[PDB]
C-alpha cells in the first residue's frame, strides 16, 4: 500500500520488494540503520537502474539517544586522471550528453558500500551477513520486474545493448516485460563475496580491479589505486528554520539543501496559502522563485573542499529581501541572472561564473 501506519517502525521505499525486507529487519529488533542498509542492497537488486554500490548517496540520520544528526556522504570522487576539459571534444566543444553519459570518464569512484560500512558500526546492531542475504536470494533466484523497471529497460535498450548488460537485461533482442523474472546470477556472486571477505573485495579485490578494467575499456581513467584510496565522509547538515519548524538538509557538495531552503525563504514572505493550490498565482511565484535559486546554483555550487559556496550569503535575510524584489505577481522577470550573495558573506569567489548547455 501507498499509505500506512505503525507503532514501532516505519519503512517507505521506492520498491515493494524493498520495503518488505527492511520491515522484517525492524520486526526482528534491528534498528533503522540496519534496515536502511538492507533496503539499499534490495533496491540495488530490484531497482538496479536507480541506486547501487556502483554509485553514490547521502544518508541522513537522527541518532537515538545522542540526538545529533549527521550524513554519511558516499558521493563518488573523480579519479586522479580526470581533467577539467575531459568533456570537450578536440574542438573545445562539449561532448553530447548521450556520449558523455556512456563513457568511462563519467564514472566516479563508487562509494555506496563504504557508506554502508560507515553507517553500520556507527549505529549498526546486526549482521554483517544478515542484511545482504535476502538480496542474494532475489539476485540468485530472481523476482518479477515492476513496470518502472520494465520501462527503464525498454526506454534504454540502446545504452544497455552496448555493454555486458545486454546479455541479461536484453535476453535476445528484446527487453524483459513487466512480470518477467529477472535473475542476476553474477550480481549474486558479487554480493556473496561482499559478505564474505568484507568490503575490500571492492576497494582492494577482484571487484575493484575488474572495475578499473572496464572504466579503461570504455575510455575512462580509473585505476585500482583510485578505488583503494576511496573513503566516505561524514557531514553535519545545513539547517534552516521555516514556518516555525527546523530543517536539516544536505550541504555542499549537494546544491539541494541550500537552494531548497532558499526557495522556501524566498517564498515564505508571500503567504502562498492565500491562493488556491491550482491557481495561476501559486505557479507563477513558484516559477519565479525557482529561476532565482537555480541561477544561484549554477554560479556558486560545488564540492566545498575545492570551492567556496556562500552558504551564509545565499540565505542572508537582507539578500533574500534583495532577490525577493525580483518576484512579483505583476509580471515575469526576464532578467534571470545569479544574485550577488558575496555582498553579504566575507570572501571572494575562487572561480568564475561559466554558462553550461
Amino acid at each position: 500500500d501507498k499509505v500506512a501506519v505503525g507503532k514501532d517502525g516505519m519503512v517507505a521505499t521506492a520498491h515493494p520488494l524493498a520495503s518488505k525486507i527492511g520491515a522484517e529487519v525492524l520486526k526482528k529488533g534491528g534498528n533503522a540503520i540496519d534496515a536502511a542498509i538492507a533496503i539499499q542492497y534490495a533496491l540495488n537488486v530490484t531497482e538496479p537502474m536507480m541506486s547501487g554500490i556502483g554509485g553514490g548517496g547521502f544518508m541522513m540520520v537522527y541518532d537515538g539517544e545522542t540526538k545529533e544528526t549527521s550524513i554519511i556522504n558516499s558521493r563518488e570522487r573523480a579519479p586522479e586522471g580526470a581533467k577539467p576539459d575531459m568533456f570537450l571534444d578536440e574542438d573545445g566543444k562539449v561532448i553530447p550528453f548521450s556520449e558523455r553519459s556512456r563513457h568511462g570518464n563519467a564514472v566516479g569512484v563508487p562509494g555506496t558500500l563504504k557508506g554502508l560500512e560507515a553507517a553500520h558500526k556507527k549505529w549498526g546492531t546486526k549482521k554483517m551477513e544478515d542484511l545482504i542475504s535476502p538480496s542474494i536470494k532475489l539476485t540468485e533466484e530472481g523476482f518479477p520486474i515492476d513496470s518502472v523497471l520494465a520501462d527503464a529497460i525498454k526506454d534504454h535498450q540502446d545504452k544497455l545493448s552496448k555493454t555486458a548488460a545486454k546479455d541479461i537485461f536484453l535476453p535476445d533482442g528484446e527487453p524483459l516485460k513487466e512480470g518477467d523474472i529477472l535473475v542476476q546470477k553474477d550480481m549474486a556472486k558479487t554480493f556473496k563475496l561482499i559478505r564474505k571477505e568484507g568490503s575490500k573485495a571492492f576497494y582492494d579485490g577482484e571487484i575493484g580491479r575488474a572495475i578499473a578494467d572496464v572504466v579503461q575499456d570504455f575510455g575512462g581513467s580509473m585505476t585500482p589505486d583510485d578505488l583503494s584510496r576511496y573513503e566516505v565522509t561524514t557531514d553535519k547538515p545545513i539547517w534552516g528554520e521555516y514556518h516555525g519548524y527546523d530543517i536539516a538538509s544536505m550541504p555542499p557538495p549537494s546544491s539541494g539543501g541550500v537552494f531548497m531552503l532558499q526557495m522556501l525563504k524566498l517564498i515564505d514572505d508571500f503567504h502562498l496559502s492565500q491562493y488556491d493550490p491550482k491557481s495561476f498565482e501559486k505557479y507563477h511565484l513558484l516559477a519565479e522563485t525557482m529561476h532565482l535559486s537555480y541561477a544561484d546554483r549554477a554560479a556558486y555550487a560545488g564540492d566545498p573542499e575545492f570551492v567556496d559556496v556562500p552558504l551564509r550569503g545565499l540565505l542572508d535575510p537582507d539578500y533574500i529581501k534583495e532577490r525577493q524584489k525580483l518576484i512579483s505577481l505583476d509580471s515575469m522577470n526576464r532578467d534571470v541572472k545569479e544574485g550577488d550573495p558575496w555582498k553579504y558573506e566575507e570572501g571572494e569567489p575562487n572561480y568564475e561564473i561559466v554558462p553550461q548547455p
Binding site: 507503532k7 524493498a18 525492524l26 533496503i39 555486458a164 539543501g257 556558486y300 564540492d303
Partner: protein
C-alpha cells in the same frame, strides 16, 4: 536516483537519497559481476572554470536533498526524492504543500508540481489546470504542450500525539510504505 526512509522504536530517523545518476548509470555493467556503473561525473560542468568544474578527487555537484524536519528539537517529518536537478523543487513543493497549505502528507506529495530552472526549461505534472497553464504562458512562461511526472517523494511523519509513524510512498513508481508493531 531513489529516496527511501526508515524510523525505529528507539528514535532513530533515516532519510536516504542515493543513485547511479542516469538510469543504469553509464549503462556499463562490471563484466561477470552484474554491477551497474554510475556516470556521476557528468554532474560536473562541461565548460571548465566554474565552481562545479571537473577536478581530480573532487565530487560532482548533486541535487540530492534528503531532509528531516523538526518541531521543537524533535524530528516530525522526513522528505526526499529523486528526479535529477528537479529534486530541489520537489522537496520544496512537498514541504510547502504540507506546512504552508496544511495538506495531509499524502496530499502534499500527490499535489502536481512544476519545475523550471531557466526561461528555457519548464516541466509540469498532470493536474495543472489548462486555463491556468494557458494564462501562465500568456504571461511569459513556457509550460509545454504535455505533462510529465516529476520526482518520487517517500516520507514518514512522526505522530507524537497518537504515538505512531505514518509512512507514504509517492505514486510516481510502485513504491510502498509499511509499519511494524510488537
Amino acid at each position: 536516483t531513489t529516496h527511501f526512509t526508515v524510523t525505529d522504536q528507539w528514535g532513530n530517523v533515516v532519510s536516504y537519497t542515493t543513485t547511479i545518476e542516469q538510469l543504469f548509470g553509464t549503462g556499463i555493467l562490471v563484466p561477470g559481476y552484474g554491477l551497474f556503473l554510475n556516470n556521476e561525473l557528468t554532474d560536473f560542468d562541461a565548460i571548465p572554470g566554474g565552481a562545479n568544474e571537473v577536478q581530480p578527487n573532487k565530487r560532482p555537484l548533486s541535487s540530492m536533498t534528503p531532509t528531516i524536519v523538526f518541531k521543537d528539537e524533535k524530528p516530525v517529518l522526513t522528505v526526499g526524492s529523486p528526479g535529477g536537478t528537479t529534486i530541489i523543487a520537489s522537496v520544496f513543493q512537498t514541504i510547502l504543500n504540507y506546512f504552508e497549505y496544511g495538506m495531509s502528507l499524502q496530499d502534499a506529495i500527490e499535489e502536481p508540481r512544476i519545475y523550471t530552472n531557466s526561461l528555457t526549461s519548464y516541466r509540469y505534472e498532470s493536474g495543472m489546470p489548462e486555463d491556468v497553464r494557458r494564462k501562465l504562458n500568456d504571461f511569459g512562461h513556457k509550460f509545454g504542450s504535455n505533462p510529465v511526472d516529476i520526482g518520487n517523494v517517500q516520507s514518514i511523519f512522526i505522530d507524537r500525539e497518537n504515538k505512531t509513524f505514518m509512512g507514504v510512498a509517492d505514486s510516481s513508481r510502485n513504491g510502498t510504505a509499511v509499519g511494524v508493531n510488537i
